[PDB]
């Protein structure tokens, strides 16, 4: 009921498909950032929404800027998220699996780099 995920200096996560076992009550993502670039140059977060909500979350988050960790404050569309991290920093987020529904499509992404392809699927199994 946990996954370790890395975001690197070239705007890539080390996975693009996360599976959450449906028997898990909570799920945890441990985000880290190998590489050498600091947060105000190549910062990453990990953000979860429905596939439908992803674009809005990214557009509104980018507009919110670096000091808001590239996320719209109190965004109802964001199921779970970490803070923004630079190289050598780490952050974890845990969420209730009850927040995911069978039949729905979910995406994870880094909001500042989602447009550059830093995204993937999250699926219940
Ligand atoms: Cu990123």
Domain boundaries, the chain: 1-125
Q: How far apart are the CA of 46 and the centre of ligand 1, in A?
A: 8
Q: How far apart are the CA of 41 and the centre of ligand 1, in A?
A: 10
Structure tokens at 70: 């590239």
Per DSSP, the three-state class of 37 is: coil
Judge whether 122 and 18 are in contact, CB under 8 Å. Answer: yes
Q: How far apart are the CA of 11 and the centre of ligand 1, in A?
A: 5
Cα angle, residue 4 at apex, residues 125 and 122 outer, rounded to 5°: 35
Distance (Å, whole) CA 52 – CA 72? 17
Q: How far apart are the CA of 42 and the centre of ligand 1, in A?
A: 6
Q: How far apart are the CA of 114 and the centre of ligand 1, in A?
A: 7
Phi-psi region of 88 (alpha: psi -120 to 50; beta: other; left: phi over 0): left
- Residue 33 marked in a binding site: no
Judge whether 24 and 97 are in contact, CB under 8 Å. Answer: yes
Architecture in CATH of 1-125: Sandwich (2.60)
Q: What is the resolution of this structure in A?
A: 1.6
The kind and range of the H/E element at 59 are helix 54-64
Q: What is the dihedral of CA 4, 9, 11, 15, to 10 degrees?
A: -30
Closest CA to 110 of 1, 9, 28: 9
* Alpha-carbon separation of residue 103 from 31, 70, 76, 119, 120 (angstroms): 26, 29, 20, 20, 17
């Amino acid at each position: 009921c946990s996954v370790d995920i890395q975001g690197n200096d070239q705007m890539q996560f080390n996975t693009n498909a996360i599976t959450v076992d449906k028997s898990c009550k909570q799920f945890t993502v441990n985000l880290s950032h190998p590489g050498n670039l600091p947060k105000n140059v190549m910062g990453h977060n990990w953000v979860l929404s429905t596939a439908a909500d992803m674009q809005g979350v990214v557009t509104d988050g980018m507009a919110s800027g670096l000091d808001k960790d590239y996320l719209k404050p109190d965004d109802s569309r964001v199921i779970a998220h970490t803070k923004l991290i630079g190289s050598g920093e780490k952050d974890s987020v845990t969420f209730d699996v009850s927040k995911l529904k069978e039949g729905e499509q979910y995406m994870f992404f880094c909001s500042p780099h989602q447009g550059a392809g830093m995204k993937g699927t999250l699926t219940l199994k």
